[PDB]
Amino acid sequence: LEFVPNIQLKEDLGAFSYKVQLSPVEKGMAHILGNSIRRVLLSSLSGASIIKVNIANVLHEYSTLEDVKEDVVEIVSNLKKVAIKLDTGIDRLDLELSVNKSGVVSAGDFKTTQGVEIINKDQPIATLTNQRAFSLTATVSVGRNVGILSAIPTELERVGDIAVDADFNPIKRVAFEVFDNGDSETLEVFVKTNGTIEPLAAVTKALEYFCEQISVFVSLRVP
Amino acid sequence: KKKSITQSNELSPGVLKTVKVFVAIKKRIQPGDKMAGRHGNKGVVSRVLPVE
């Protein structure tokens, strides 16, 4: 009477929708596993987002560039929605964007440096009414959401440096359901993500974090 | 601009000079803030909870 669970990435659907399912359960441990997976992914996942942006010709967020329909605050808002995928060892990196287009600037316009990946090619950073030279630098670092109260503002060295808030967590929605095959159950979880991190890898990471937390209890020791 | 008395104002006699400073600070809703519905139902936020 031994059952061991397995992970299958099945029923992938939507632009970024996945339904990881485990064929084997302990016939009653399925609900606990689903609750743990749902809680861990939302608050334990770490994502890398821009925290600092410097415009070529700005002294503060509340300024208007010549021949630009978008406002500097509006440009910062467009920058925040941008989705970035980073290498495991990169930790922190700087992205340089310079464009002379007379059309609409875009996230894809960002220089294709190694490691840096931009999922949101479609999202446009700004729109230029007339031909002009536009350049800016955005700092990207790995981070996780520790809550609004426990947040470090971040030091700014350059006069032009502007602080930008970043939402590190990439999992928009988590759903789980339990089906009993008789003497055993199958766990079905629906995960919605920006697509920066593959769903199966994220599920494995969340389970690993839960196991690490439960590790202390079996020991019943400080360490 | 040059049509002014040279101080941009009379300045009130006995005042050597004046300076005006403008500061803009963003504000985000926090506990103890007051939110009022159009129907007239009103409340003050007591705490912020996690999404989960």
Curated annotation (Swiss-Prot), chain A:
Residues 1-221 are annotated as: Alpha N-terminal domain (alpha-NTD). Keywords: DNA-directed RNA polymerase, Nucleotidyltransferase, Transcription, Transferase. The chain holds residues 8 to 230 of 323 of the full protein. Its EC number is 2.7.7.6. One of its GO terms (biological process) is DNA-templated transcription. The keyword Nucleotidyltransferase applies. GO terms for cellular component: cytoplasm; DNA-directed RNA polymerase complex. DNA-dependent RNA polymerase catalyzes the transcription of DNA into RNA using the four ribonucleoside triphosphates as substrates. Homodimer. The RNAP catalytic core consists of 2 alpha, 1 beta, 1 beta' and 1 omega subunit. When a sigma factor is associated with the core the holoenzyme is formed, which can initiate transcription. It catalyses: RNA(n) + a ribonucleoside 5'-triphosphate = RNA(n+1) + diphosphate. This is DNA-directed RNA polymerase subunit alpha 1. GO terms for molecular function: DNA binding; DNA-directed RNA polymerase activity; protein dimerization activity. Belongs to the RNA polymerase alpha chain family. Disulfide bonds: none annotated. The N-terminal domain is essential for RNAP assembly and basal transcription, whereas the C-terminal domain is involved in interaction with transcriptional regulators and with upstream promoter elements.
UniProtKB/Swiss-Prot annotation, chain B:
Transmembrane segments: none annotated. DNA-dependent RNA polymerase catalyzes the transcription of DNA into RNA using the four ribonucleoside triphosphates as substrates. The RNAP catalytic core consists of 2 alpha, 1 beta, 1 beta' and 1 omega subunit. When a sigma factor is associated with the core the holoenzyme is formed, which can initiate transcription. Belongs to the RNA polymerase beta chain family. This is DNA-directed RNA polymerase subunit beta. It comes from Francisella tularensis subsp. holarctica (strain LVS). The lineage of its organism: Bacteria, Pseudomonadati, Pseudomonadota, Gammaproteobacteria, Thiotrichales. The gene is rpoB. The chain holds residues 1046 to 1097 of 1358 of the full protein.
